[PDB]
């Protein structure tokens, strides 16, 4: 029902080794569609999903120009951050930004985002009201006073209620066949002997979109979420995802364990067991 | 689509 668009900024300073590196990636839900790297030869915004290639030449030039301007913008940010914290000009530091929007079934804005981190810690974030800012410390409060006087949030709100949702709707339609159709996971349970009295049962999910998934092992009907080994959901590289869940079980009791699979593409939640 | 944010710290 709901969808989202995100842009991810990474600015990394490297004293002596040139200018700061600026990188940008765009996602619609869990699909990458656009990218930019400042260290590319003739740097510009590139397509990463076939449905974005439909966009005209005016799009790519303006997209590229924003990215090239950002390289300058975030070079200023990094230097300003140094003075704000009394840090030396010889250290490598990171600034991150995530911004985008969430839409409902009607294509309306659910909520908007504009969040900043410095060296992995919260710096400044746009409130859900799209009018005020949350500073994580006193250094970021300086930015907050700057941004309140300069009426920054207005620009944010204008984009999120206007261009953000408008462009997302266009992307969702142009790539409806992949973005709006969910891919069901292919599931199976494998058997791996460890000792004489202990075997690992591994519950697989393969080729699913979107990434959102829940895999829980159950014995006799009770949640085994403490004795479950769980790996992070991982990209297959073909835009679909992978995940598995493991549980060490006694020999001859494999039939007593159940794997519950929850995913958007599944008409009903699946329950699986080891097939001897 | 992106938008340009020229505002800094």
């Amino acid at each position: 029902g709901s969808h989202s668009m995100r842009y991810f900024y990474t600015a990394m300073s490297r004293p002596g080794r040139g200018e700061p590196r600026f990188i940008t990636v765009g996602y619609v839900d869990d699909t990458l569609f656009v990218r930019f790297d400042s260290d590319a030869t003739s740097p510009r915004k590139e397509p990463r999903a076939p449905w974005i290639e439909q966009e005209g030449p005016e799009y790519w030039d303006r997209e590229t120009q924003i990215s090239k301007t950002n390289t300058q913008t975030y070079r200023e940010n990094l230097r300003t951050a140094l003075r704000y914290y009394n840090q030396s000009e010889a250290g490598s530091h990171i600034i991150q930004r995530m911004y985008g929007c969430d839409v409902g079934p009607d294509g309306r804005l659910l909520r908007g985002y504009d969040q900043y981190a410095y060296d992995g810690k919260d710096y400044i974030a746009l409130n859900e009201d799209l009018s005020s800012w949350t500073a994580a410390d006193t250094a970021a409060q300086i930015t907050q006073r700057k941004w309140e006087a300069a009426r920054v949030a207005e620009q944010d709100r204008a984009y999120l209620e206007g261009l953000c949702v408008e462009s997302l709707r266009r992307y969702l339609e142009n790539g409806k066949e992949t973005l709006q159709r969910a891919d069901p996971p292919k599931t199976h349970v494998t058997h791996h002997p460890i000792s004489d009295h202990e075997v690992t049962l591994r519950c697989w999910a393969l080729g699913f979109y979107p990434a959102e998934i829940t895999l829980t092992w159950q014995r006799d009907g009770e949640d085994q979420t403490q004795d479950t080994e769980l790996v992070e959901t991982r990209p297959a590289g073909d835009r679909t995802f992978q995940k598995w869940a493991a549980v060490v079980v006694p020999s001859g009791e494999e039939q007593r364990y159940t794997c519950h699979v929850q995913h958007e593409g599944l008409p009903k939640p699946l329950t699986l067991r080891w097939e001897p | 689509e992106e938008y340009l944010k020229a505002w800094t710290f």
Epitope: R62, E76, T80, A150, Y159 | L4, A6, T8
Partner: T-cell receptor
Framework: KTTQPNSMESNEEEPVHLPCNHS???????IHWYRQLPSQGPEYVIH???SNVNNRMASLAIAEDRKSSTLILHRATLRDAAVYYC??????????????FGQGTILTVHP | GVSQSPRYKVAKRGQDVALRCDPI?????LFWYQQALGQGPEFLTY????????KSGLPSDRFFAERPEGSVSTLKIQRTQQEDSAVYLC???????????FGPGTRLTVTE
Amino acid sequence: KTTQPNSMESNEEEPVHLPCNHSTISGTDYIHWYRQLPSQGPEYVIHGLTSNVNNRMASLAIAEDRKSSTLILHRATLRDAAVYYCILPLAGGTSYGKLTFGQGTILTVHP
Amino acid sequence: GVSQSPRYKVAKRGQDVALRCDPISGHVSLFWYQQALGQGPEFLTYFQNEAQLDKSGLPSDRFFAERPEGSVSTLKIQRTQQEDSAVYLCASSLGQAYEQYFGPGTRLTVTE
């Protein structure tokens, strides 16, 4: 890129309305106004985006469709006689704050 | 505020001149503009701290600009020509997009 009138006359102690056209404005562009008094460096007056902004000397009024705006001086003095520039510094998402003035409305305030 | 020296400079054609700008302390952004008579100011070059990141407004490679320590800025015009005659304006801001504070300008006149 903005267009504005060639000149404007007004009496002192009376309000001045300085109009500006910007029909190609991006939904995220800022409207800025600067001014230059005779034989002096330019100076910032006001800026805004969608809703009207207030000072005790100058106000900015932006149209609903955002295609035009107005610089309102409330109590214009002889000192206010200047050139007034209407600028879109971001230029539709292509520039960083560097100012393009470039052709403004010459003020005359009459005693 | 921002200051500039000298107020006025009369120069013989072919000689080199130096235009100095002392910006407001703690301002990252520094702008130079050129104002030829009967016109608005025109962007010359930009400084982010000590870094000259945009010089697309400079008329020729005779215009040499520097801001070595991120503060005081110098615009050197080598071998001055009649066309260089104008007011040169220095502006500094708290950051690239914030309000620019202008100096009183340097009036240069190049004579034969």
